[PDB]
Each structure stands twice: as structure tokens, then as C-alpha cells.
Design a protein around this ligand. Structure first.
Ligand SMILES: Cc1cc2oc(=O)cc(CP(=O)(O)O)c2cc1C
Ligand SMILES: [Zn+2]
Ligand SMILES: [Zn+2]
Length: 229
């Protein structure tokens, strides 16, 4: 199931979808895994989230070249923290068009991140304004409200049972909501439930720091966030 490729791990989730996993030593927390996605859409590849670092992200591109061998048309990154945007320079060095929530791009410099080239904006109901996400193919981008961060976004993969919650969603056995340093504790619970409601048929919930889980990940994350109120 898991394919080790250098210091990264890749796991196929569906015929056209793989999870990428990279690791960073956090003093006091061990070597922390972070997950993103790789999607083949016909003759091109779409990426959700970088790895923690430029070098790791270049290795994702190397894995794509060896295992898929199609151009990477774009990447979308799901908030302005290192696990999701730390490898932006590697995407730009490779010539890949990059997208993030406008707010993520605004926050990127102060977070020590490099902004994506393009900014996504969202309707009042949370769905991305399609003009800002051209050529996204099966990627359906949804802003659920502030939670893990104020800028966190989520992605469903049309034609699959997969939805990606990023750092907003924790697994059904998680003991905490993780890093709340930039979290909106008041709105977290509602944002988690809004993610589930935006992707009601998604049976495989992919997230940043745990293996894919059932929809119980959503209901359990929302119960834990209730305590922050
Ligand atoms: C323990 C911990 C602390 C953190 O402090 C930060 O400032 C940013 C992150 C990355 P995050 O997972 O929040 O996107 C972070 C991650 C972990 C595990
Ligand atoms: Zn984060
Ligand atoms: Zn995280």
C-alpha cells in the first residue's frame, strides 16, 4: 500500500488519486507527517499542498515524473503554514502554476512562506469563485469558514469518494485538535461541519496528519471543537 520514495511516502487512494506524505522533526513533537494529494486528470497532474520543504516538494515532482510522467498543470495549497506551503519555491522553479486562498497569499510573508502566484476568492456560501480557479478539472475547492486557521480551505475530488480537509479535520480517534496557535476557536466546530455538508457523498476523508478515515473523522473533529467554546 505505502510506497517509500526517498524520505517520502506515497499511497494510492483511487485509480487517479495518490496521497503524498512528508516528515519534519518538530522539537518536542517528533517527526510529524503531513499529507497532500496528487490527482491525474487525463493528460495532466494536479497537486494539493506542498511538502514541508522545497527539497521534499521537488521529490514529489520526481515521483510524479517517474510514476505518472505527465505535466503538473497546477497546485493548490490549503493554508499558510509550512506543512502546506513550505515547498512553494520548488513548484515555481518547476514552472507550475500555483493557487491559494487570497488570505493565504496575504499571510504568506509573515508566516515565512512564499505566496502562490494566483489568489482564490470565495462566494458567501464558501464555494470558490470559478473564475479564480480556472482549469481545476475535478478539484472542487470550498472555504468552510475559519477553523484550524482563518484561511483554511478544503478540496473534494469529483468522480471519487474523496474529500480533503487539510489541517481542519482530525481522525476519529484523535485526542486533540493539534496546533491551535492560529485557530478560530469560536467558529471551528461550525467550519468542520460545513466541510462535511459541502461534500456529503465523500466517504474517504483525507487529512493532513492522519491516514484517510471515514466520515466519523468529521463528526469527531466537530465534537472536540465544541469544547473550545
Ligand atoms: C506541534 C505543531 C506546532 C506547529 O506550530 C506552528 O506554528 C505551525 C505548525 C504546522 P500546522 O500543522 O499547524 O499546519 C505546527 C504543527 C505542529 C504539529
Ligand atoms: Zn496549519
Ligand atoms: Zn497541520
Amino acid at each position: 500500500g505505502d510506497q517509500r520514495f526517498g524520505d517520502l511516502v506515497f499511497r494510492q487512494l483511487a485509480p487517479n488519486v495518490w496521497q503524498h506524505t512528508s516528515y519534519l522533526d518538530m522539537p518536542g513533537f517528533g517527526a510529524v507527517a503531513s499529507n497532500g494529494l496528487i490527482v491525474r486528470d487525463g493528460g495532466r497532474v494536479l497537486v494539493v499542498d506542498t511538502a514541508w520543504t522545497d527539497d521534499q516538494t521537488a521529490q514529489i515532482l520526481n515521483w510524479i515524473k517517474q510514476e505518472i510522467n505527465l505535466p503538473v498543470a497546477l497546485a493548490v495549497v490549503t493554508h499558510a503554514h509550512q506543512d502546506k506551503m513550505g515547498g512553494m519555491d520548488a513548484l515555481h522553479a518547476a514552472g507550475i502554476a500555483t493557487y491559494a486562498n487570497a488570505l493565504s497569499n496575504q499571510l504568506a510573508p509573515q508566516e515565512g512562506m512564499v505566496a502562490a502566484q494566483h489568489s482564490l476568492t470565495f462566494a458567501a456560501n464558501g464555494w470558490v469563485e470559478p473564475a479564480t480557479a480556472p482549469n481545476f478539472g475535478p478539484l472542487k475547492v470550498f472555504y468552510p469558514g475559519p477553523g484550524h486557521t482563518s484561511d483554511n480551505i478544503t478540496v473534494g475530488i469529483d468522480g471519487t469518494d474523496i474529500a480533503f480537509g487539510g489541517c481542519l479535520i482530525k481522525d476519529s480517534k484523535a485526542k486533540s485538535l493539534g496546533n491551535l496557535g492560529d485557530a478560530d476557536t469560536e467558529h471551528y466546530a461550525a467550519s468542520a461541519r460545513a466541510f462535511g455538508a459541502a461534500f456529503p457523498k465523500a466517504s474517504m476523508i483525507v487529512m493532513s496528519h492522519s491516514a484517510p478515515d471515514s466520515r466519523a473523522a468529521i463528526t469527531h473533529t466537530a465534537r472536540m471543537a465544541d469544547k473550545l467554546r
